[PDB]
Amino acid sequence: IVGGRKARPRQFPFLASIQNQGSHECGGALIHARFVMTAASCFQSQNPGVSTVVLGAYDLRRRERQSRQTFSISSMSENGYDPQQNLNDLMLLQLDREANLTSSVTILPLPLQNATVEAGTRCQVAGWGSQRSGGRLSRFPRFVNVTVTPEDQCRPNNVCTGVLTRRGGICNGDGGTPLVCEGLAHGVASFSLGPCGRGPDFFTRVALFRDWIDGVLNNPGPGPA
Ligand SMILES: *[C@@H]1O[C@H](CO)[C@@H](O[C@H]2O[C@H](CO)[C@@H](O)[C@H](O)[C@H]2NC(C)=O)[C@H](O)[C@H]1NC(C)=O
Ligand SMILES: *[C@@H]1O[C@H](CO)[C@@H](O)[C@H](O)[C@H]1NC(C)=O
Ligand SMILES: *[C@@H]1O[C@H](CO)[C@@H](O)[C@H](O)[C@H]1NC(C)=O
């Protein structure tokens, strides 16, 4: 995150940290005691989904034993994700077991199917991503205040944003992290236009996948084999 402030512990308790061999690859949000919503695109590979999921974190550098919760991924689900054009970049992770709902870990609610957010609306995005193109991750979470742009510079499958001050927005490590507006997860950080903090951050429209998500939540099994 570029152009933002440092958060306080438990300021965003829904927040997840997806890791690989202990290193932070992407963000996410806890949407159900057993699922984490994130970007499908975090899911390229080079050691594919052999990842972990850390809840309750703050300082990426410490163990924070009495606040964190660690989990492995039993399954992963997506709806028509397409990498060439980045369409439908959304994926749900099923945790090996129920997350204990504490003061440092909570659920982020979801908008109803087909809902919308008008241009000009104020939202926030937060994460442990870097502050500059190809730069170190942030050890603590940071957040910035965003504003939803007019539909003509976005895309239908997305919900775009900008900052009144040059430089603000997502950056490396911020992928999968949620855009919250009006206390609901209206977005899933996908990709960004050019130099971090420059102009039009693209987020996946969560309101389009609502019934599908409900679908997965309701019949929790690993899928066919
Ligand atoms: C949400 O909106 C869509 C479009 O207004 C409604 O139906 C559409 O969905 C059908 C099933 O996918 C499609 O066959 C149409 O192509 C499709 N159009 C778009 C572009 O998606 C849908 O009924 C609405 N649902 C509710 C719950 O409001
Ligand atoms: C709460 O969940 C944790 C982490 O998943 C688990 O190890 C623990 O047993 C649960 N706590 C209580 C006191 O049972
Ligand atoms: C968020 O917005 C509020 C209200 O405009 C403001 O007081 C605060 O500085 C903003 N924070 C960031 C981190 O941009």
Swiss-Prot record:
Modifications made to the protein after synthesis: Cleavage of the N-terminal propeptide which is composed of 7 amino acids occurs in two steps. The initial cleavage of 5 amino acids is followed by the cleavage of a dipeptide to produce the mature form.
Membrane topology field: Peripheral membrane protein
Region entry Possesses antibiotic activity, spans: 20-44
Alphabetical UniProt keywords: Antibiotic, Antimicrobial, Chemotaxis, Disulfide bond, Glycoprotein, Heparin-binding, Membrane, Serine protease homolog, Signal, Zymogen
Keyword Glycoprotein: yes
Gene3D superfamilies, sorted: Trypsin-like serine proteases (2.40.10.10)
Residue stretch(es) of the prosequence: 223-225
S-S bonds: C26-C42, C123-C181, C154-C160, C171-C196
Domain Peptidase S1: 1-218
Family per similarity comment: Belongs to the peptidase S1 family. Elastase subfamily.
Biological role stated in the UniProt entry: This is a neutrophil granule-derived antibacterial and monocyte- and fibroblast-specific chemotactic glycoprotein. Binds heparin. The cytotoxic action is limited to many species of Gram-negative bacteria; this specificity may be explained by a strong affinity of the very basic N-terminal half for the negatively charged lipopolysaccharides that are unique to the Gram-negative bacterial outer envelope. It may play a role in mediating recruitment of monocytes in the second wave of inflammation.
Protein name, entry field: Azurocidin
Species per Swiss-Prot/TrEMBL record: Homo sapiens
